[PDB]
Amino acid sequence: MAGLGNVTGAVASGDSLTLTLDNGTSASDILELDVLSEELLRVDYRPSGAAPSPSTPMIDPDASWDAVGATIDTSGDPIVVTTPRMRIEIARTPARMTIKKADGTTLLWEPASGGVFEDGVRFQRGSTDNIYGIRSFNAQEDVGGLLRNSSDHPAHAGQQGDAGGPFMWSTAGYGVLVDSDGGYPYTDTTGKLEFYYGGTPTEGRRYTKTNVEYYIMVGEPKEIMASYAQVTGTAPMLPKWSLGFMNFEWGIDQDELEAHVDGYRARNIPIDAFALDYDWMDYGEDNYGEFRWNTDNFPDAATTQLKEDMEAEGIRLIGIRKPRIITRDFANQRTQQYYDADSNGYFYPGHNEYTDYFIPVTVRSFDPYQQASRDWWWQHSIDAFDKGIVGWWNDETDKVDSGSAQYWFGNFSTGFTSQAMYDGQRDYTNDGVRVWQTARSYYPGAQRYATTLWSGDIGTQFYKGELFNWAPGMQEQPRIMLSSANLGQPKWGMDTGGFNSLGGASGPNPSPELYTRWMQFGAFTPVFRVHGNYNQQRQPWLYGATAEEASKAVMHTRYSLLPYMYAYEREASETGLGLIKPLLFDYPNDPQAADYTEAWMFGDWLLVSPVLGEAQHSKQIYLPAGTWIDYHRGQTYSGGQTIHYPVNADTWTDVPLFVKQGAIIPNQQVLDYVDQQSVTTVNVDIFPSASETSFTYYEDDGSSYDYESGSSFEQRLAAQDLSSSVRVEVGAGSGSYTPDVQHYVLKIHGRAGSAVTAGGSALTGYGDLQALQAASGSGWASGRDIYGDVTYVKLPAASGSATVVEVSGSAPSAATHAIYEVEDASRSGATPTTRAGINTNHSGYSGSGFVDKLDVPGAAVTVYANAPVSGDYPVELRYANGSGSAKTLSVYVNAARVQQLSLADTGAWSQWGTQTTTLPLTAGQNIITYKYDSDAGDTGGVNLDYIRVPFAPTQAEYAAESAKLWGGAGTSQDHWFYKGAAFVDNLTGVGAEASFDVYAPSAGTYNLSLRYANGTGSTKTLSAIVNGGAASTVTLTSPGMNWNLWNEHTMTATLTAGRNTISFRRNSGNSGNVNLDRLAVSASAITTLASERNLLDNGDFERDTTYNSNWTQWQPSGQPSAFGIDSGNALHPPEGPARRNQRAYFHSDNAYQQSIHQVVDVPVNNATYRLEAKVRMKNTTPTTARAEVQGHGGSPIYANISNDGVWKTIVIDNINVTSGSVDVGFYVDSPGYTTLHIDEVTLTRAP
Amino acid sequence: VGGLLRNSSDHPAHAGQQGDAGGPFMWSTAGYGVLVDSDGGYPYTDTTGKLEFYYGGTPTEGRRYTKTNVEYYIMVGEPKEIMASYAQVTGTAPMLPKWSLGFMNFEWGIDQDELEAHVDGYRARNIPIDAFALDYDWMDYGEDNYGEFRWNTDNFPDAATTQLKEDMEAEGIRLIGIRKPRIITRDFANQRTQQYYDADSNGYFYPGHNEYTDYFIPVTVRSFDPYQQASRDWWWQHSIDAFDKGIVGWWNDETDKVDSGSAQYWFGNFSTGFTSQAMYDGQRDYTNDGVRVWQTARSYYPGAQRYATTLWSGDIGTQFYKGELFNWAPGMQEQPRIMLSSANLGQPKWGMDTGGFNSLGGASGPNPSPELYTRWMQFGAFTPVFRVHGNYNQQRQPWLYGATAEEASKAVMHTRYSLLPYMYAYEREASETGLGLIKPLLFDYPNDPQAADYTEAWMFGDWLLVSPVLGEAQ
Ligand SMILES: C[C@H]1O[C@H](O[C@H]2[C@H](O)[C@@H](O)[C@@H](O[C@H]3[C@H](O)[C@@H](O)[C@@H](O)O[C@@H]3CO)O[C@@H]2CO)[C@H](O)[C@@H](O)[C@@H]1N[C@H]1C=C(CO)[C@@H](O)[C@H](O)[C@H]1O
Ligand SMILES: C[C@H]1O[C@H](O[C@H]2[C@H](O)[C@@H](O)[C@@H](O[C@H]3[C@H](O)[C@@H](O)[C@@H](O)O[C@@H]3CO)O[C@@H]2CO)[C@H](O)[C@@H](O)[C@@H]1N[C@H]1C=C(CO)[C@@H](O)[C@H](O)[C@H]1O
Ligand SMILES: OC[C@H]1O[C@H](O[C@H]2[C@H](O)[C@@H](O)[C@@H](O)O[C@@H]2CO)[C@H](O)[C@@H](O)[C@@H]1O
Ligand SMILES: [Ca+2]
Ligand SMILES: [Ca+2]
Ligand SMILES: [Ca+2]
Ligand SMILES: [Mg+2]
Ligand SMILES: [Mg+2]
Ligand SMILES: [Mg+2]
Ligand SMILES: [Mg+2]
Ligand SMILES: [Mg+2]
Ligand SMILES: [Mg+2]
Ligand SMILES: [Mg+2]
Ligand SMILES: [Mg+2]
Ligand SMILES: [Mg+2]
Ligand code: NI
Ligand code: NI
What we know:
Chain B: It comes from Paenibacillus sp. 598K. This is part of a larger assembly, with two copies of chain A. Chain A has twelve helices and 81 strands. By secondary structure, the first copy, chain A, is mostly beta strands. Among the domains of chain A are: about 5-230, Immunoglobulin-like (Sandwich), CATH 2.60.40; about 955-1080, Galactose-binding domain-like (Jelly Rolls, Sandwich). Chain A has an eight-stranded antiparallel β-sheet with strand order 1-2-3-4-16-13-12-11, with helices on one face. In chain A, helix 5 (about 370-385) packs across helix 6 and helix 8 runs parallel beside helix 9. Chain A starts with 6 loop residues before the first strand and ends with a strand. Strand 22 of chain A pairs antiparallel with strand 10 of chain B, so a sheet runs across the interface. One nickel (II) ion (NI) binds near residues 11, 16, 20 and 22 of chain B. One magnesium ion binds near residues 15, 36, 65 and 67 of chain A.
């Protein structure tokens, strides 16, 4: 904010004057003045004499003036330029310009305080001078006058009929024009007349100028304006017809046009032109539709005929143009115009795609408050109902939000809209089809008419403000749900996956992580539904294998709980309480439940707390008074505390779910839909408490209002743990509905009895659950499951009288394995009629059958096996192979391809064998899938009978990132070759620690191995603290100055049966300053874990892309990178990862070469290794697309990638390494538009 | 999104919008509830111990059930007992079909083939699902004869009969359909609908809700960059065909600002000039300077004039003045000030939508009155770019406004057209000095204080001063 310095040189030459100004440095400022006309001066200020920037497009590039012959007198102070019309004085000390008329009248001057500077011009003039220019007003603004005597409005083009620019002039005889892209003119009534470049204005700035180029005009307004047009350009002449009247019109076609022109001509009302709005063009369509004549509206525009016929009637045509292209046709296909624009960079910078609307329609709200209005609404709805609309999604019953229409519906609109459909559908069907509706508001009473509530247009993000701030996301939703419940509307759901994104419908889908977590969440809410914006897709397979499998998994849990759930639907008809409730319902005096929403009750007997955090490794979960049993992991917790709960951030398989002691939970086989088949056996899991608890099992038709007049079935189930037995009462049948249930199978957890009695009779004992199920009439059996000892008791349901069962004694199973019969498991395949099957047509099977039709590509069977801790589980597959030779099948665990199983011929189809494979399981639920994956080279073609999963692993693992961290310990991905989804760093402050919860079957000494990094150069120390006992020192050597190296610290620890705490803390004497990754635990010597075989760093590309990996890339010199890593969720439909959240891609609009490589030193030189990857290719066939192995001692090995669109597995086996290292790579050579996706790359030591 | 606690609460009791819920129902885990019968109202709590409820004034949402008495309920018990009592007073919930405990896929942008393929994708994977919910796709929303209640057989051919219902039932799929509590009162062809006539004659529209123009087919678009030569070449190249077949003037709209949903993007100050430059350079090359360019844009920044463009005053209001009918757009009376402000910035080739663009309720709203129309045509005829325009399916031919509007319009048009050779000289003048057909009086009278802010009259060429009648009933 400072003016020019003194003149140190003046060089006149023709009409130019060049001034050098002192700024105190060797690089002086320049000020070039040019006299352009007698009444027009150019001034260019170049700070430090640097070259001027290019002139903006304000300036006419072709402007040209006659020589003026001005008089420039450099002899005196001031320096003096004169013409006949003006006099310019520049004082020397400091340099200051005064502008005058020839006659000496002062027009304006730069003040002492400062004139021109680096960022603008500053003048002073007569304070009563009237100023003009700068700005106009738009069609949304208050409209001022012409005077600009107190102005600070920016100079901009503006919008909606605005005009403006850096042009301030006065009727007092002068004008000032500054070459600028936007900026801030300033005037006030002290006489100031200023212009500042200022900061980037709202409209953007794409022409910046290091210089200040300005023009000073002198004269009357006509002369001022003439000079403005010499500088900025004159207007070319419009066609003469442009002086005529024109009729602009929106909503018009060729017939109407012709009528309109006839009307004008018949009445001798002149007219030269019509302007046509959207009507004229095929806006919305492919092939440059927004440039081509709409021949539906204007048929004769197929040729020049329309032009020529209107010419003959004296009509020229004008056509509307929007400076934008349609990037998606009405069929949701990328347009040709998109491809051309995207490839050549023709989109406006900073403007992304966005969703517009363009066909208007006129609507008006209906009144549901009137009975006669409601009847009419229903009567016109009947035809839609008979043709299959049987649920009513009653949208927008709350508020209209649309231009000038901001109208509110009243508080009873949702109830009355709902009543219309309810009284209506009830009358028409004679109480024979139950009503289902949803609305997006609730007020009391509305529930009488059978409506749910959904949370409206929520955002596709983790929480409010993650991605944008105008809608909440996933994390807020439990608070909405529980608030609805506190209002007596527990029948609630949400748009799982979110509705809104930045840019509207074209905005991103949810990430695979966000989608997976949201499905896990919604499976434990009452109205379980996905939704999204226009042309968005929400099918779980589109989000990659983790999202598919985890979603499937939690959906199986929900559907297995149908009989549990449905009893709550019944309760809502008696008391209004439904399937969910907040903890404060059950714990009204617990201050920790008062505002608790991160967990909630699902029915009476399950507390659920979904993982809602992005990249979350552990949850803090409040458990209120009682005793809780982990649904998936088996351990107990006592209530009245907040627990630390590890979750596997890599698999996304956990849904933290806890059984309340007392629980009586009816459940059933998984159906594809609710009434797919009759269910004749209901399971009832019972976890007895010392006080009686009960559950009233309930059936009815599921369809009609018959239940209202007694047509239903109920039976009261009740349980109690006694001093030395468990008592369970199956009360007598009640009601008139003949239920489908024939037998309950009670699963009484906590005791494996030696006897089960009832009415003076000891029930017949069978050897196992299987043999019990196959028996007719009553029995018992016992076993072990994830929870511990269990007693099974099979009974008739729907007896006319009460049955009281008492399980006594304790005779625990010695079973070491659970058995899952795969014919009870999940059967799938590529199409609905090529799924794997159940069969009994060969002998020797266990259970009720085995699984066949693993002989069409993609056929598979999927078992959900619970594990108490993470680790190595040797899982036995019983199968038959009567094909004459060995057959292959993939084993997938938690959506990762673990192994190709080679299954030997067994002699015949009725002869069975066993293959045992060590599986990397995670604590809680695991997804184990045996699949014919022809794209991985499997053959399929075997039959599977069961699998056997040990109750205990051979060795356990615990992730450091999922441990309780304290004292500054945190998680990080900022170094390479960690296992799992992260590691623990920042063990630097005293008190910093990681505390593992380790389980043991028996008291004893166990081996530990702790995986740690130490790149400090020297040995460092932590303390180990087992069960709060005495600190032992842990001495951790350093491989060197390198944080990408990991070693094992081996040690023993004395442990107790059950839960143990083992901490690694920096105590005051310890030095700290190491990174921890995983603790392995076993009764035997610890070996390589099945989860940790991968020698690559970031082989799954899951690492947050802010952080690097051992991957490197290459392209030819001067080519942009074609390589990135992301989730594919921006695309519609999503092109998702193969597993978890991310995948590498190669893509370019133009021709390209691209590779990525990773080099690793192998653990054992002179041995065999193996490369596996998932790869997907689409669009243009490339010249080369391959996996590559090289640098290993032998010559390059290649495996080609085949253009398809689908995820395939590429494998390079028998990599004989003799160099000590291996380079694995992927390379594409493309002519353009080849997309390659790479995922799940593993380099392992090969059998 | 807050918590569950309502310990310091003044939020009103309403149904709300967009997933909201509320009511005059206040209860505590300390062992009590309070339910008041009310249509809206104002619950109040605070940490000194107040638990209050006020009817107060008419809410935002309206109030159709007013009450002289005060009917309330006190509940005593633990939370589940309070909630049961609430359901005794306001109603228990009827049981929903059992399938409604299943998974449901809701979708917007779906036809029969896609639905079938989705369902096949679930079943093939043994991923359970009981229901698809269909958005607008399922219905002939926008058409006559109750189209907003009728299956769209272009998207769902087999919903012509019970076939879709039945094949989907066989696959374990129930169908849900979206409903909107409104009807279309003008079909796509601007014709009043059967459903309109039925609701109007029976009184079935929501009180206080007039009709209004909504939009319903979404399209995806992206702005082009006219700042680059190769972009302009491309834009022109693709316009040649439309030009050969009769588009000889370029009405370049929305070169200023995107105001659309979440999308709020500005174009730069040279956007108009450069858009204009694309058509100018192009047409001139292609016709070898044989066909004069004409264009209009709704913004002006200096230099844009070089590329042959006029300026229009945007989506102005169909009204005499700002605030006569609505406050959010100016009307006719303001337009001289805008025109003359453009002139002072060197853009005298200026026009306006004679008749106005915007009315209350959108395109469905009122045309100009004959008086407004007539006075505006008279004014228009003495401005440089003389044009009527209006909103979607609105009409601006003068004969529709009755015989005074017809005849007075004709008359003033005849005056304008007789002045062709007077006018055309000023067109020539704008090619030499940039001065044009209008100018404010302060150009001729730079020292007259009565001319300094004067915009109720102006000069049309050098020798005529015009001051159109713009007051109602003046
Ligand atoms: C048709 C017009 O649509 C867009 O702008 C209009 C809005 O959609 C309207 O809702 C209205 O907005 C106002 C609110 O209703 C009101 O409550 C208040 O908040 O003010 C708002 C205005 O600030 O009016 C808008 C302006 O007309 C769109 O942005 C606009 O460009 C559209 N007009 C052009 C389009 C066509 C159709 O091709 C042409 O016929 C016109 O000449 C164009 O200027
Ligand atoms: C489709 C949806 O549209 C309407 O509301 C949405 C707006 O159209 C969007 O532009 C967006 O507005 C936000 C601005 O982008 C943002 O800058 C900020 O100002 O906040 C605005 C909103 O607070 O989002 C709006 C909300 O989605 C309309 O009012 C709404 O009812 C519409 N949603 C229903 C329509 C369909 C299609 O039939 C259903 O699929 C949905 O489930 C409905 O809820
Ligand atoms: O009014 C003159 C003023 O202009 C500049 O400030 C700009 C600022 O850069 C913009 O970001 C925006 O907020 O508008 C302002 C003007 O309204 C100068 O930096 C300042 O010194 C000067 O007084
Ligand atoms: Ca079996
Ligand atoms: Ca780890
Ligand atoms: Ca991955
Ligand atoms: Mg010169
Ligand atoms: Mg004054
Ligand atoms: Mg600068
Ligand atoms: Mg029309
Ligand atoms: Mg004709
Ligand atoms: Mg066409
Ligand atoms: Mg779709
Ligand atoms: Mg089919
Ligand atoms: Mg139809
Ligand atoms: Ni402005
Ligand atoms: Ni509210």
